[PDB]
């Protein structure tokens, strides 16, 4: 069963730069092999098949190179309207017909920290048994950040959950929400309630913390 | 004016079933073979099957083998897939997509409908504030299913430094979302900021106010 492997995970380019993915199979589909594009909440869009040949509507900035094993997309000269995700897909030996995990094109920006926020639980949720803190990361870049909850010192691993929205289409820019969730018990036994943001725009970790009371 | 619109997708029991849909437009369409390909969350696409542009051929992937069986009905522009026994590996957005003029090429794919796998029972968001002490504040709609809600504030009328995020699942099986907005502390006493929460899978409207 063939293997595609795509490289990089996730892009970042600037717009007017030359955009080069790669798709690894594990065994020559040979000629055989398309490029899609997606952008969330939209349909696939086929890009190229047959590895160099584009089909109707979609741009010259757009070429598909290779053979067998070896295959590469450039987006030539970026438009906004390419960061998308972008996926191979061969049709040699199938079914099935196997895909790449995607690659990411997104948008390069220059680093732009976090702001960050905390918040305690309302009086309301406590009283239904259960608490969660929430912490808000507002618009950094890039999206790669870390958010590390401290409960009294103490760190805290398995209790969190979190999002990330997508790249902003104005700021370029990511936000991220975490929530730590614990029991009503826990919380008010407690009293250092603390968010660590870890991020490269950042000289050091930035804490926001509340006492409970 | 090609266009492939799915439909039937919906909420399930693990062990369950539905039947999908997929209607042809703008093309014909017995002419063309038909591809069914999921894409769960924070995941990929992946293949499953696809049914010739006659009738005769069906394939399938190993996994919905057994579960998972397709069909068409040219002369209604539809085409069909039954699945059975549904897993929550099964859970994600299916997308049918037209084979080209067996190409193995999707040329044209539609948005998609969406499948859900829980045992969880619907149930309408708990609204909670994240209260401001610029400033940030914003609404915790919690503990709903299905998918999706949607949130504004003040009913349209904030739009600037709002920030929507995508729901978690937690493991009761109920989601949880976040809703902020970042706006001038100035405007904290002053200024009435309300989200406004709409659950329509549970028929579900809370409107929450938020102050400091």
């Known amino acids: 069963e063939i293997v595609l492997t795509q490289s990089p995970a996730t892009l970042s380019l600037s717009p007017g730069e030359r955009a080069t993915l790669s798709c690894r199979a594990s065994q020559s589909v040979g000629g055989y092999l398309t490029w899609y594009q997606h952008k969330p909440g939209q349909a696939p869009r086929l890009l190229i098949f047959d590895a160099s040949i584009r089909a109707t509507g979609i741009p010259a900035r757009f070429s598909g190179s290779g053979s067998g094993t070896d295959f590469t997309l450039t987006i030539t000269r970026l438009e906004p309207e390419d960061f998308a995700v972008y996926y191979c897909?061969?049709?040699?030996?199938?079914?099935?017909?196997?895909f790449g995990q995607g690659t990411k094109l997104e948008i390069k920006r220059t680093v732009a920290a976090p702001s960050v926020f905390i918040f305690p639980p309302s009086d309301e949720q406590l009283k239904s048994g259960t608490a969660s803190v929430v912490c808000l990361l507002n618009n950094f870049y890039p999206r790669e950040a870390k958010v590390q909850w401290k409960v009294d010192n103490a760190l805290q691993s398995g209790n969190s959950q979190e999002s990330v929205t997508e790249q902003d289409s104005k700021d370029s820019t990511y936000s991220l929400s975490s929530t730590l969730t614990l029991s009503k018990a826990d919380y008010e036994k407690h009293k250092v309630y603390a968010c660590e943001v870890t991020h490269q725009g950042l000289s050091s970790p930035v804490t926001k913390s509340f006492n409970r009371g | 004016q090609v266009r492939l619109v799915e439909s039937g997708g919906g909420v399930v029991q693990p062990g369950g079933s539905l039947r999908l849909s997929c209607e042809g437009s703008?093309?014909?369409?017995?002419?063309?073979?038909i591809h069914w390909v999921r894409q769960a969350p924070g995941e990929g696409l992946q293949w499953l099957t696809v049914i010739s542009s006659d009738g005769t051929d069906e394939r399938y992937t190993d996994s919905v083998k057994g579960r998972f069986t397709i069909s068409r009905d040219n002369s209604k522009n539809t085409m069909s897939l039954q699945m059975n026994n549904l897993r929550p590996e099964d859970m994600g957005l299916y997308y049918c997509?037209?084979?080209?003029?067996?190409?193995?090429?999707?040329?044209?794919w539609g948005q998609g409908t969406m499948v859900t796998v829980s045992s969880a029972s619907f149930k309408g968001p708990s609204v909670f504030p994240l209260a401001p002490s610029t400033a940030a504040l914003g609404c915790l709609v919690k503990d709903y299913f299905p998918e999706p809600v949607t949130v504004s504030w003040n009913s349209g009328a904030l739009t600037s430094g709002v920030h929507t995020f995508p729901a978690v699942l937690q493991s009761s099986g109920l989601y949880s979302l976040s809703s902020v907005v970042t706006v001038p502390s100035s405007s904290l006493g002053t200024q009435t900021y309300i989200c406004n929460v709409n659950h329509k899978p549970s028929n579900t409207k809370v409107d929450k106010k938020v102050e400091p």
């Open positions: 997509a037209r084979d080209g003029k067996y190409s193995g090429l999707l040329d044209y």
């Open positions: 897909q061969q049709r040699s030996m199938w079914p099935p017909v196997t």
């Open positions: 703008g093309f014909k369409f017995g002419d063309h073979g």
